[PDB]
Write a protein that binds this DNA or RNA. Structure first.
Lengths: 75, 52, 328
RNA sequence: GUUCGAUCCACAG
RNA sequence: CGAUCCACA
């Protein structure tokens, strides 16, 4: 359980965007606080000390995750 | 199109240098035909503005 | 606010009694035109349309060069500074590729965003930024990052943003723009892109178009005039103007051109702050480019030491015969 | 980073 | 033998 941060917004290109303080690997699995599958890390970018993260939502309607804290799940 | 101002050098989107008042041209140079169909032509008037 | 090139190094004197024979070599300035060409670089302003290779290809054919190359690829829709080293100077592009670049960009946004926010987000992207996200690893891996030295937003009209950006070699502005757009939600793409700097070469009086370049060359072959064509071509030294330099003495020049590495005792003077492994330009005391190499010592070690190998010579540019064999 | 040519085998006093 | 220069994968 590796806290990413709050979902800033849903991007038109179809990606949840989180600002964070570390670097997730490509394809890490992403979950919410109640622990459910939300999508996968597809891009990391911006300042190394404080990266933006782009998540491909593997969920029906993602626009409902803004404001929500997402987590990466090693195992 | 990215425009350039011939006097100040300044780069702009506008038709009039907001730093040198002058009219702006496109920043990109012109296309170049590799066989340069009309090169001896361009060279003809070029010779007469350099004094050649 | 500026590239690393732009930082001026200090010059340490090692042999303060070192002098140079005017009979040997050729300062860039007083090079005969044909020789000037043989060791030249053109600060070319590439046109939208061709691939960087096609451009060079044309230059080859039109000037009848046996070879040439360019100093950092520009994509076909892109214009601006494209250094083209000719003939015997061709390999100097190696000193250019690593070099910092400056562009002027047009970003088109896919939705509407206030300016206060466009400025603010864009400054998040100055500094060390992430290029390729890492891959899942069982061990601490290397992470791909490039530096953005400065982003200066020039003006904003609506969805269209025009900015100047200085970056480390290997930074894709197309990619920067996409990432920025992603960070503003609406998305974005690159409308236009012009290169305004490539290491030492910039938009100045020496920057010449394909049209002028060919025209000036005809003005020489047909009209017997060398002044214009000469002005279009720069001394390869220019290409090496952003690198740290070790100036050797005349006694050492032919040794280097004959395949010796540069030993400490051959050194007359050097730039401060050379780290082992850095790219260095070895120069004549008349400021001719003798060769490029990797530093095997630091400025300090080079300065203090009295024997040893200072620089591993990698590429030699100067003709074996400009300075006499003075060794052994 | 591997094939035979060319030059040299050079601490620069 | 080793470097550098030149040509070819």
């Amino acid at each position: 359980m590796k806290r990413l941060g709050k979902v800033l917004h849903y991007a038109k290109q179809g990606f949840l965007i989180v600002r964070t303080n570390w670097v997730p690997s490509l394809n890490d699995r992403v979950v919410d606080k109640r622990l459910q599958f939300v999508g996968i890390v597809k891009d990391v970018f911006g300042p190394v000390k404080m990266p933006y993260v782009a998540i491909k939502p593997k969920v029906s309607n993602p626009e409902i995750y803004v404001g929500e804290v997402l987590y990466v799940d090693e195992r | 199109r990215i425009r350039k101002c011939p006097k100040c050098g300044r780069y702009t989107l506008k038709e009039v240098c907001p730093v040198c008042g002058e009219k702006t041209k496109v920043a990109h140079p012109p296309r170049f035909s590799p066989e340069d169909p009309y090169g001896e032509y361009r060279r003809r008037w070029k010779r007469e503005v350099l004094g050649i | 606010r500026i590239l690393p090139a732009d930082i001026k190094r200090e010059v340490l004197i090692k042999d303060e009694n070192a002098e140079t024979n005017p009979d040997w070599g050729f300062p860039p300035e007083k090079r005969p035109i044909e020789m000037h060409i043989q060791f030249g670089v053109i600060n070319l302003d590439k046109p939208p349309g061709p691939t960087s290779h096609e451009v060079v290809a044309w230059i080859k054919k039109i000037l009848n060069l046996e070879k040439a190359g360019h100093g950092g690829t520009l994509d076909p829709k892109v214009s601006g500074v494209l250094p083209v080293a000719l003939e015997k100077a061709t390999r100097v592009v190696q000193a250019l590729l690593p070099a910092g670049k400056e562009y002027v960009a047009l970003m088109h946004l896919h939705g509407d965003v206030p300016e206060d926010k466009i400025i603010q987000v864009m400054k998040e992207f100055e500094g060390e930024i992430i290029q390729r996200p890492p891959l899942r690893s069982a061990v601490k891996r290397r992470l791909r990052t490039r530096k953005v030295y400065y982003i200066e937003v020039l003006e904003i009209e609506g969805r269209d943003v025009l900015f100047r950006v200085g970056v480390e070699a290997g930074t894709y502005i197309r990619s920067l723009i996409h990432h920025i757009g992603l960070a503003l939600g609406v998305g974005a793409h690159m409308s236009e892109l012009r290169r305004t700097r490539s290491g030492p070469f910039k938009e100045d009086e020496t920057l010449i178009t394909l049209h002028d370049l060919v025209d000036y060359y005809y003005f020489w072959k047909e009209d017997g005039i060398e002044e214009y064509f000469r002005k279009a071509i720069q001394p390869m030294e220019k290409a090496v103007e952003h690198l740290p330099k070790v100036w050797i003495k005349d006694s050492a020049v032919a040794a280097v051109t004959h395949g010796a590495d540069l030993a400490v005792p051959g050194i007359a003077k050097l730039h401060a702050g050379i780290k082992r492994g850095d790219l260095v330009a070895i120069m004549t005391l008349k400021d001719e480019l003798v060769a490029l190499g990797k530093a095997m010592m630091t400025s300090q070690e080079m300065l203090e030491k009295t024997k040893g190998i200072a620089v591993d010579v990698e590429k030699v540019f100067m003709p074996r015969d400009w300075y006499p064999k003075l060794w052994e």
